[PDB]
Design a protein around this nucleic acid. Structure first.
Ligand SMILES: [Cl-]
Ligand SMILES: [Cl-]
Ligand SMILES: [Cl-]
Ligand SMILES: [Cl-]
Ligand SMILES: [Cl-]
Ligand SMILES: [Cl-]
Ligand SMILES: [Cl-]
Ligand SMILES: [Mg+2]
Ligand SMILES: [Mg+2]
Ligand SMILES: [Mg+2]
Ligand SMILES: [Mg+2]
Ligand SMILES: [Mg+2]
Ligand SMILES: [Mg+2]
Ligand SMILES: [Mg+2]
Ligand SMILES: [Mg+2]
Ligand SMILES: [Mg+2]
Ligand SMILES: [Mg+2]
Ligand SMILES: [Mg+2]
Ligand SMILES: [Mg+2]
Ligand SMILES: [Mg+2]
Ligand SMILES: [Mg+2]
Ligand SMILES: [Mg+2]
Ligand code: NA
Ligand code: NA
Ligand code: NA
Ligand code: NA
Ligand code: NA
Ligand code: NA
Ligand code: NA
Ligand code: NA
Ligand code: NA
Ligand code: NA
Ligand code: NA
Ligand code: NA
Ligand code: NA
Ligand code: NA
Ligand code: NA
Ligand code: NA
Lengths: 142, 49, 142, 150
RNA sequence: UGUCCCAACGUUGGGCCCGGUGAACUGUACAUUCCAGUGCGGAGUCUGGAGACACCCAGGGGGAAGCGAAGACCCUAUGGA
RNA sequence: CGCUCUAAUUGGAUGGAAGUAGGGGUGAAAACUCCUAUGGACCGAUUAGUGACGAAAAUCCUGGCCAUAGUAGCAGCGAUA
RNA sequence: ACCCUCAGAAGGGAGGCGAAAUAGAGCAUGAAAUCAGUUGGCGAUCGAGCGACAGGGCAUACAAGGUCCCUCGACGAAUGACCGACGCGCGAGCGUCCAGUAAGACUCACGGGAAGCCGAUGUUCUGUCGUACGUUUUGAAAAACGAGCCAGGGAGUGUGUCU
């Protein structure tokens, strides 16, 4: 609820990792960022394998635990954490001043970062974060 | 004979104690033991002339 | 009604341009503490410097982060070695006769701690009249 | 033996002490910590309740194996050191006594400072299996109390 | 015939809470760890990740190659009996 | 570099020595030195000598002390008081 | 001594002696380990050889250290441009000139400023490096060996001969 994002990024039809990479780089420069339409972000690859990885991540674990998100919500955020030294003071700060949302709760339309967009016309081997989540068993709350 | 006036002996291994000669459970004779002999002491024999 | 130290407390020595620069160098550069390795891990191990002898010693092996090892290269500038931070060359003084031959411009005097208050007073007054500074002066209420 | 570790203005201060008391040095800590800042009069009431077992002494440092007590506040473990608490009534009885004999209102005096110190042990020996013997000592506690006008 | 199928309930003394008394083993240091990897090839401490708010009570003992004993086996000594 | 005692030369101390605590300055350093407090009688320097002369270690020796812990035991016995 | 307290020849308080009772009875001094109370720093969302060197927060009576901060300016090793002009390259971009110029560590001078202020000390945060020490070992952080901690003790000496 209410997040003064100096920058709002739209992930729709954007390569998750390429977005995450830049979103990290900015948050570490002190920028408050909000990622919008997570459920519509995409990651290239053969769907079947891609789901095997993510599914393997949900299954990993023991008493100590290995909490892995199922919602395209977390998925994106965990993807971004992996690009920040989240256990240092600086990093945790940069990670906390960032937020990912399902769809868009703002009025403004997010911008599209350069080099993160995927042309659906010249591309068929890719997957939607949402699609991934539905397989993992999440609750399509979007 | 200073420090050598006793039958102290070492129990050897077996009680988690260092191999030091003991008597009535008190270490003795050896140089590193309080009341022990003086390793290299002053000597009458030495020629100080 | 307030304390006032006796003698030329404010006196400064006159140094050639080279000495003064060399003095400033010593004051700027400084030097490592050179404390005995691991003196901070065990109370029975004091700070007094001892050459690490361990065949596997991490210091003796020069592993960055484990401390500097005493070397000649660490010496202070020939021209300023031993000088008080003021620029003066100290002279240990035990009585009034020790004040004889002392250049009040190049040297300052330090009264040994053993000397009593009676003898101190005499030393402190005649030193001043000789244009010499007393590094450890007596504070009298004036 | 100890000496007052704090400075006390004689015109507004009453002093007292216990010497070589063979009691729990660990309970003393607790009790002292607890009653500090209280009024000699509130203090006696408290300790008498502790002795009655209706009030418990927070055991914050020396608490291994100690059971929780619903009445402790902000903490969980606590007991009722009666022996140590009785020794503290004597101390207080003495300080309120010196307080009055000096013209102050004893009971109404704040407990400015109160500290226990372990001054030694009365050494004892306990025979054990296998023809061996071991320690079996008693701690000797000293305790300083400084009352002060409100 | 409760040795077993297959365990149940009960009795007494402990255990648990309170007052009093009051030890010992053990301790290089640090220490909330887990999964992998690496390393003198069997890591709470290295490396990558994961997890982890602090303190306390009871428990049964998985790990600390847990504690206890300078290995009795084996070989070596120009050792002993 | 530092320690003990000797000798020659030469200094300091009840107008407060040594030692100790905290603190300032020098030396690459062994170490030297000063300040404040405590202490209340001894203490140095230079040179030449002297030697039961420098410790973090030896399951080292002796003493003292903490965690363990307000923990185990103060129940178990055909005599349950 | 006396007085108050106390079951009390205990202890405590007040008081007396003495230069000193923090010289009060195992009583000169009174270290370290370590304990109580307390002050500074840190602190119940966060990672472990406990630090070295840098650089920040907070804290600090004097004394024994007195420096340090910002404008400008002087000097200025190695290194060394932007912009603009012209010419190349499919392109990223390069060449020539501007120019070995501007810049460039330290040091200094004028002016202004700081006294918790500079150093330094205590604690804490950040960066870099960092799995004790000694020993055994080809190889030790080692799941190889030693120590709970501290203090004091603890290991090339004498005679004879030779060189
Ligand atoms: Cl899990
Ligand atoms: Cl991290
Ligand atoms: Cl495609
Ligand atoms: Cl040299
Ligand atoms: Cl205790
Ligand atoms: Cl310079
Ligand atoms: Cl030798
Ligand atoms: Mg002897
Ligand atoms: Mg130390
Ligand atoms: Mg319990
Ligand atoms: Mg027997
Ligand atoms: Mg890790
Ligand atoms: Mg063996
Ligand atoms: Mg055999
Ligand atoms: Mg034989
Ligand atoms: Mg001479
Ligand atoms: Mg050694
Ligand atoms: Mg236990
Ligand atoms: Mg019966
Ligand atoms: Mg004494
Ligand atoms: Mg081997
Ligand atoms: Mg020694
Ligand atoms: Na991909
Ligand atoms: Na999982
Ligand atoms: Na004998
Ligand atoms: Na002789
Ligand atoms: Na505790
Ligand atoms: Na409560
Ligand atoms: Na409570
Ligand atoms: Na049965
Ligand atoms: Na276990
Ligand atoms: Na031992
Ligand atoms: Na600091
Ligand atoms: Na070894
Ligand atoms: Na080692
Ligand atoms: Na190993
Ligand atoms: Na022990
Ligand atoms: Na020796």
């Amino acid at each position: 609820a209410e997040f003064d994002a100096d920058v709002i990024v739209d992930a729709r039809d954007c390569i998750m990792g390429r977005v995450a990479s830049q979103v990290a780089e900015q948050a570490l420069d002190g920028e408050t960022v909000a990622v919008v339409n997570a459920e519509r972000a995409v990651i290239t690859g053969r769907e079947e394998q891609i789901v095997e990885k993510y599914e393997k991540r949900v299954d990993i674990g023991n008493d100590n635990g290995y909490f892995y998100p199922k919602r395209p919500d977390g998925i994106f955020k965990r993807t971004i954490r992996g690009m920040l030294p989240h256990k240092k003071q600086r990093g945790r700060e940069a990670f906390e001043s960032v937020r990912v949302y399902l769809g868009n709760p703002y009025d403004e339309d997010g911008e599209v970062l350069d080099g993160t967009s995927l042309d659906r016309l010249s591309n068929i081997k890719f997957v939607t974060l949402g699609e991934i989540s539905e397989t993992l068993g999440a609750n399509k709350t979007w | 004979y200073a420090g050598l006036r006793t039958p102290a002996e070492s129990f050897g291994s077996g009680r988690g104690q260092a191999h030091v000669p003991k008597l009535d459970g008190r270490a003795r004779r050896v140089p590193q033991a309080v009341k022990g002999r003086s390793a290299h002491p002053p000597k009458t024999e030495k020629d100080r002339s | 009604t307030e304390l006032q130290a006796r003698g030329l407390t404010e006196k400064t020595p006159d140094l050639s341009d080279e000495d003064a620069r060399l003095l400033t160098q010593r004051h700027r550069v400084g030097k490592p503490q050179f404390n005995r390795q691991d003196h901070h891990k065990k109370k029975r191990v004091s700070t007094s410097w001892r050459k690490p002898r361990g065949q596997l010693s991490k210091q003796r092996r020069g592993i960055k982060g484990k401390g500097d090892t005493v070397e000649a290269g660490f010496r202070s500038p020939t021209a300023v070695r031993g000088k008080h931070p003021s620029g003066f060359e100290e002279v240990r003084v035990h009585n009034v006769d020790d004040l004889e031959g002392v250049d009040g411009d190049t040297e300052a005097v330090r009264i040994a701690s053993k000397v009593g208050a009676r003898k101190r007073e005499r030393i402190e007054e005649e030193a001043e009249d000789a244009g010499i500074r007393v590094l450890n002066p007596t504070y009298v209420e004036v | 033996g100890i000496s007052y570790s704090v400075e006390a203005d004689p015109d507004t201060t009453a002093k007292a002490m216990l010497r070589e008391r063979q009691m729990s040095f660990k309970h003393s800590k607790a009790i002292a910590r607890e009653i500090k800042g209280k009024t000699a009069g509130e203090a006696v009431d408290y300790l008498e309740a502790v002795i009655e077992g209706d009030q418990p002494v927070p055991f914050k440092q020396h608490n291994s194996g100690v059971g929780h007590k619903s009445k402790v506040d902000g903490w969980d473990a606590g007991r009722y050191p009666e022996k140590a608490s009785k020794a503290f009534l004597d101390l207080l009885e003495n300080a309120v006594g010196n307080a009055d004999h000096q013209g102050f209102d004893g009971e109404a005096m704040t407990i400015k400072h109160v500290a226990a110190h372990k001054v030694g042990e009365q050494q004892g020996r306990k025979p054990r299996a296998m023809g061996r013997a071991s320690a079996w000592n008693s701690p000797q506690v000293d305790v300083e109390l400084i009352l002060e006008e409100p």
